[model samples]
Target: STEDAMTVLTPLTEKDYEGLKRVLRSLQAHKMAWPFLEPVDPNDAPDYYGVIKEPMDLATMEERVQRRYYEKLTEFVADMTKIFDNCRYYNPSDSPFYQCAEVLESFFVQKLKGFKASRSH
Candidate 1:
């Protein structure tokens, strides 16, 4: 049960960051990485396979991930808030694409929080 959830700890170093970068790059190449892996179409039956296909170029994926990482990172850093700080503030007035971007950013932020916390503690 979630109540019984335990946090697992592992030692991380600069080398781990390099390894994570390599893994992220691989996931990006396969379009299975953060921000870029977010679903673009919700009405259609989910394209589970397409998530693993090259949805965006490496540079595009990198840009999206980096931007999202900082936005979330900055929010957390500024307020010492939960990693999911931006998850609930979606604006329906915005473009659908922008909303999607917000969701993607939230996902990446959560991930970055995990990495940062793991590294620091």
Candidate 2:
């Protein structure tokens, strides 16, 4: 029995790596990104860990990028998506944290689009 190998053959190019780093820096600089910079403190919200089994943040993503952990764009995007999804799940729609995630998600989509445009050119 032969099965397709689930291996990632393509890794990010140096150019793509630099571009992603720029986007990460912009995300870190955004005012709405303050809450997502670091891991949520269990002391601050004891239940956060219980609800968000996989907590993700910009700081952790940046560290992974520096270490070249992401082999493809989808891997990096998945982590960012996790961050937004986790926030929306943990916080209510009326809360600022939820709103911030919404705004930042939009910003990230736009930046990703621009990045793709540049790459396609």
Candidate 3:
């Protein structure tokens, strides 16, 4: 329904950049961020890239933000969620990595929800 199909129309701004940076900083500081802070290594997960066509991570996301590549907040959100989605898809439900993804994903979901509500303040 339209209620769950929320969208952001605002163009990217310095404020947005800073806000996103801050959020990423918070995520990076998390204890569960070890597996997500950097790109997946072929040695660690040899079949990772083969399984995930569009791999994403916090480091790549930070570079993209620094390069001002995102045009909308949704684009940034897309990349953020991609990290968790890829993790869950590549790892088993009971695996530690998958559990990390669930924890971090929920943390970010709450962050985004709080962020959206703060837009009017």
Candidate 4:
């Protein structure tokens, strides 16, 4: 689940950053190694795979993850409040999707009972 993505991603070192860059560079041209693996070819040059790049540094990615976590929480809560007729709340961090579905199911079944009760009146 992309929603399962942690707001606090594992922090990266300078080595990690460089390693990621190197790995991505190697992957860019869909080649396992480089020219030597399949030379006599323009496509397999060492630097031919230069188009790939990281859009942001590690810090920026972390900051965005943290920011979006709260944003997603806000959305989950706001939707839940509406679903429950403004009567309940929950911690979105605690397996929110499952809990929310359980609560909403309860609400529907309870409301159906209420509907039958009112009809008997």
RMSD of each: 12.8, 5.3, 4.2, 22.9
Return the clash pairs for model 4, or none. none
Query: Which stretches in model 2 have alpha-carbon errors above 4 Å?
Result: 1-10
Residue range 34-121, candidate 4, lDDT tens digits: 2111212225334422422212222332343344432332332333234333112322335443354455545534543443333210
Error of 3 at 115 (Å): 2.1
Q: Which ten residues in a row have the lowest lDDT in candidate 4?
A: 32-41
lDDT of 4: 0.32
Candidate 3 lDDT at 94 equals 96
Candidate 4 or 1, higher lDDT? 1
Clashes per candidate (backbone, < 3 Å): 0, 0, 0, 0
- For residues 1-121, what per-residue lDDT tens digits would candidate 3 score against the true structure? 3234334656666766777787888899999988899999999988888899999999999899899999878898999989998998889999999999989999888877766665531
- List runs of model 3 lying over 4 Å from the truth: 1-7
Q: What is the TM-score of each candidate against the true structure?
A: 0.33, 0.88, 0.88, 0.21
Clashes of 3: 0
Clashing pairs in 2: none
| Predictions in order: lDDT | 0.38, 0.85, 0.84, 0.32
Native-to-model Cα distance after best TM-score fit, residue 64 in candidate 1, in Å = 12
Tens-place lDDT digits, model 2, residues 1-121: 1253222233576666788899999899999998799999999899999899899999999999899888877898899999999999999999888999999999999998877666521
Candidate 2 clash total?
Answer: 0
Question: Which 10-residue span in candidate 3 carries the lowest summed lDDT?
Answer: 1-10
| Candidate 2 residue-wise lDDT at 54 | 90
